[PDB]
Amino acid sequence: SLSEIKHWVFDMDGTLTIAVHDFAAIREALSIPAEDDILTHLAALPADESAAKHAWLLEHERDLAQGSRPAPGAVELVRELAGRGYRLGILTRNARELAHVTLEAIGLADCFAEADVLGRDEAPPKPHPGGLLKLAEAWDVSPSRMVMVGDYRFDLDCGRAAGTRTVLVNLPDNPWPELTDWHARDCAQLRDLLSAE
């Protein structure tokens, strides 16, 4: 049962936080009417114009980015787990300092012990198991009793390599069934699963 796992490890980008983008710049560049939602409008254009505009959006993802915000239900999930006294960690490609700043920004800095936030300098890149093995050792716990929560195949591969359980969030379905122990559309639904199962 998911509620039996008391040691949780989170990816950051795409899991606890998501990139936000300049909506007004997007609307101007792609000629979206104010009364239309961006994606709904693009989906309704002729296929060739839709493809061209989507390709442009993707090409300029970084130009249009404006930092990040908490992913849906992420703050809620982490606070729920922290409230249970569970042990929480982070395994991110970000530098530890930046991860720290982000955690403070989204109001979750107090939910993770500083030593349990592993960044660029503390662990090899996913899907290398190193970071999870480090946490498992620091926590004196079997990996089979930890869960790795992520949104990308490398997060799941990392969990499988280290031997932890794995959770996919922030996709609506189950694209890697064999790599994925639990899946939820987002952290809010994951919190619901935790509560029910």
The gap from C-alpha 16 to its chain's centroid, in whole angstroms, comes to 4
Place of tokens 């939820």: 184
Which of these segments, 3-11, 40-48, 100-108, 116-124, binds its own copies (CB under 8 A)? 40-48
DSSP class of 124: P
Of 176, 181, 189, 193, the residue at the interface with its own copies (CB under 8 A) is 176
Of 185, 188, 189, 193, the residue at the interface with its own copies (CB under 8 A) is 185
Place of tokens 């720290």: 100
163 binding partner (options its own copies, Mg ion, none; Cβ < 5 to 8 Å by kind): none
For position 56 contacting its own copies by CB under 8 A, the verdict is yes
Least Å distance, CB 76 to its own copies, is 18
Where do contacts with Mg ion occur on this chain (CB under 5 A)? 11, 13-14, 151-152
CB atoms within 10 A of CB 31: 10
Longest Cα–Cα distance of the chain, Å, equals 58
**Contacts of its own copies in 58-77 (CB under 8 A):** 58-63
Query: 11, exposed or middle or buried, with CB in 10 Å at 0-12, 13-18, 19+?
Result: buried
* CA–CA separation, 101 and 191 (whole Å): 25
11 binding partner (options Mg ion, its own copies, none; Cβ < 5 to 8 Å by kind): Mg ion
* CA–CA separation, 187 and 197 (whole Å): 15
Residues 6+ apart with CB under 8 A from 17: 68, 69, 70, 71, 74, 102, 106
157 binding partner (options its own copies, Mg ion, none; Cβ < 5 to 8 Å by kind): none
Known binding-site positions for Mg(2+) = 11, 13, 151, 155
| Positions in the binding site for its own copies (CB under 8 A) | 13-14, 18-19, 21, 25, 28-31, 39-40, 43, 47-63, 151-153, 170-173, 175-176, 185
